[PDB]
Design a protein around this ligand. Structure first.
Ligand SMILES: *C/C(=C/c1ccc(O)cc1)C(=O)OC
Length: 138
């Protein structure tokens, strides 16, 4: 039965560069990252509240596994390791709060939501800045 499970392809990406700026990435790498972002693909497998997620671009791929409600280790958008915890906020929206393994830095979070119109919306937050990325089924 339809849930977050599937193969998703990005169609829109708002404020990605601004987010990277907040995370201290230099302009030239930001521009390359924006260009790289238009090939973001996401593969999800969901059973109950257990999730497998693989995000990839042209040259890079990362996988996470989590159970809602259970702390796990992942990276921030700028590849610093963090402790993560995901909770539901409604039937098809989840919110992840993150804490840096080492160091100090901006407060980062992310959300994933399946909409009525069959889109996947990712938001990624760093301090004051919110990046939104919209995906549709392949
Ligand atoms: C699901 C997910 C995907 C993602 C998208 C863009 C970038 O840059 C990293 C990761 C996520 O939870 O990331 C925060």
């Amino acid at each position: 039965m339809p849930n977050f499970s599937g193969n998703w392809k990005i169609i829109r990406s708002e404020n990605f560069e601004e987010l990277l700026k907040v995370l201290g990435v230099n302009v030239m790498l930001r521009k390359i990252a924006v260009a790289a972002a238009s090939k973001y693909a996401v593969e999800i497998k969901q059973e109950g509240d257990t999730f497998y997620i693989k995000v990839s671009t042209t040259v890079y791929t990362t996988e996470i596994n989590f159970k809602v409600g259970e702390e796990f280790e992942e990276q921030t958008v700028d590849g610093r390791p963090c402790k993560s915890l995901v909770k539901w906020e409604s039937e098809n929206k989840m919110v992840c709060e993150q804490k840096l393994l080492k160091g100090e830095g901006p407060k980062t979070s992310w959300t994933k939501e399946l909409t009525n119109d069959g889109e996947l919306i990712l938001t990624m937050t760093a301090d004051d800045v919110v990046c939104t990325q919209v995906f549709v089924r392949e």
